């Protein structure tokens, strides 16, 4: 993905610029497909992020996560809802199966410092589903 | 084309929710 590779450096720079702690409406691209991110797509994105870097070990922040989700949706048409983490305190597993990214403590779960860490076992073990079977249906 | 917004393809299910 040439577009994804090009957007990865800019996305990483924007995330780094934003600290760890105007227009109305919901325009939609004409003919652009919109669907939830797939497990295979999530695994591929996690592998690409791990290979390129900038996501593993970065301080987890709401603004950075929102920017990354928006960039992913713009570049792939994936809804920004699969990038959800399990509630704390402690290590939060990805909500969507196949995601290799997870948040771990770096030091109330809200005030705990969390950083993105790669985890290849996430794509094979449904840690989030096991922890919250009700949330997975 | 079509007035009122071009038709867009729909997904099959919430792939991120299993």
């Amino acid at each position: 993905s040439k577009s994804s590779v090009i957007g990865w450096p800019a996305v990483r720079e924007r995330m780094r610029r934003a600290e760890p702690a105007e227009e109305v409406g919901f325009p939609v691209t004409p003919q652009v497909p919109l669907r939830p991110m797939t497990y295979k797509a999530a695994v591929d994105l996690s592998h690409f992020l791990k290979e390129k870097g900038g996501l593993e070990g970065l301080i987890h922040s709401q603004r950075r996560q929102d920017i990354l989700d928006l960039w992913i949706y713009h570049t792939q048409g994936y809804f920004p809802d699969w990038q959800n983490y399990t509630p704390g305190p402690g290590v939060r597993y990805p909500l969507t199966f196949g995601w290799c990214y997870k948040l771990v403590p770096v030091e109330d779960p809200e005030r705990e410092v969390l950083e993105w860490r790669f985890d290849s076992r996430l794509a094979f073990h449904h840690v989030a589903r096991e922890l919250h079977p009700e949330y997975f249906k | 084309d079509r007035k009122g917004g071009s038709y867009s393809q729909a997904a099959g299910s919430d792939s991120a929710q299993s």
Binding site: - | G4, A10, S13
Partner: protein
């Protein structure tokens, strides 16, 4: 509990009648016209009439009133639903609802009336299903009516499997003359034209706020529909259990779901209008329209109706963008705009004369209504997530859907 379903006309002549119980004499229809005339001339006219011990509850159609006589304590809601179903069936079968087809399509009309309701109790109301047993140009009734699935005929085969959806938005805004919006409700409309092979069981999935909260994703853009009304194909139990929208789509275009939730956002179009009406000398219309919607969206066919004086003549319009014309039939200034980019600002300066002699009676202040229709714009932010099309034979569906934003009850109260 209707006694006799009859179709009247604008001259009082009954185009067609179909007695269901026979407990009411057919001569009571003659008094319906004088009763309706008396009610209209005295302000007491209502769709539910009453000729002594017999009630005449009916609605007014395009050209005739479908009056259904009743004598007992029948369900008025049931009669209204039957009348609406009959009107829908007539529209589906006949492209026009006028006296031209009543006197020309009686052969099929009588058969449809006889088959639809027996003894005042309707049994079938699906136009698509009814078209396989009663035709105007007969085999055994289809098993769909006998089977549970009475809205999807089995055995439908198509070369391709394409389903077209329509996320139509209805922007209804009730702005008072003081400038504040009182009734601002947006009603979603998920109308889909399903055209597939077989009897697929559609599994509709959207980014509902309740669904996101239940799944644990109640943090992204989720549509908060206060009222969600599924179609007949949608299973009520499945939606009530875990918000599972599973239903068999029909063959053709039908309304599957209709969301209805309040809106707390600013209006997409802000209209600043002034009335510099001189006392029988002249009038000024300093109407300024400000588009509060997103700039990436364009409101195709913007029609802001400005009610001008009824007796105004020789009017002059000094506007900026869009053609403005005064229609004497409607007695208002039609601010017609073809393409309105988001964030645009149109200023108008009206100037029309007024007769020296004052009017005999007051005419009132009709509200200003805008006819903005911006496609590819979802104001509520609700986006379709998935559509599980499952068939026993097994096929790859190609669902499609489009989002259309228009102005619904977007009226502006005058000063």
């Amino acid at each position: 509990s209707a006694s006799a379903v009859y179709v009247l006309d604008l001259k009082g002549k009954v185009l067609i009648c179909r007695n269901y119980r026979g407990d009411v004499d057919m001569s009571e229809v003659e008094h319906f016209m004088p009763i309706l005339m008396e009610k209209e001339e005295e302000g007491m006219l209502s769709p539910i009439l009453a000729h002594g011990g017999v009630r005449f509850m009916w609605i007014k159609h395009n050209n005739l009133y479908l009056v259904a006589t009743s004598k007992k304590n029948a369900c008025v809601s049931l009669v209204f639903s039957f009348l609406y179903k009959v009107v829908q069936v007539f529209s589906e079968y006949f492209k026009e609802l006028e006296e031209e087809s009543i006197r020309d399509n009686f052969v099929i009309i009588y058969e449809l009336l006889d088959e639809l309701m027996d003894f005042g109790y309707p049994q079938t109301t699906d136009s698509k299903i009814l078209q396989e047993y009663i035709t105007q140009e007969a085999p055994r009734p289809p098993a769909t009516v006998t089977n549970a699935v009475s809205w999807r005929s089995e055995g439908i085969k198509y070369r391709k499997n394409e389903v077209f959806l329509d996320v139509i938005e209805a922007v209804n805004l009730l702005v008072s003359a003081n400038g504040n919006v009182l009734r601002s409700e947006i009603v979603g409309s998920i109308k889909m034209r399903v055209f597939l092979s077989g009897m697929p069981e559609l599994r509709l999935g959207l980014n509902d706020k309740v669904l996101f909260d239940n799944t644990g994703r109640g943090k992204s853009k989720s549509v908060e529909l206060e009222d969600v009304k599924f179609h007949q194909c949608v299973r009520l139990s499945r939606f009530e259990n875990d918000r599972t929208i599973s239903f068999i789509p029909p063959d053709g275009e039908f309304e599957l779901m209709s969301y209805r939730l309040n809106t707390h956002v600013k209006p997409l179009i802000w209209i600043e209008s002034v009335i510099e009406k001189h006392s029988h000398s002249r009038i000024e219309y300093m109407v300024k329209a400000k588009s509060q919607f997103k700039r990436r969206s364009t409101a195709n066919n913007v029609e802001i109706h400005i009610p001008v004086p009824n007796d105004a003549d020789s009017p002059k319009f000094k506007t900026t963008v869009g053609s403005v014309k005064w229609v004497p039939e409607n007695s208002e200034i039609v601010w017609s705009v073809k393409s309105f980019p988001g964030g645009k600002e149109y200023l108008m300066r009206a100037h029309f004369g007024l007769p020296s002699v004052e009017a005999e009676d007051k005419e009132g202040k009709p509200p200003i209504s805008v006819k903005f229709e911006i496609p590819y714009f979802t104001t509520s932010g609700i986006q379709v997530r998935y559509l599980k099309i499952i068939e026993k034979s097994g096929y790859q569906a190609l669902p499609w859907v489009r989002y259309i934003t228009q102005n619904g009850d977007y009226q502006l109260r005058t000063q």
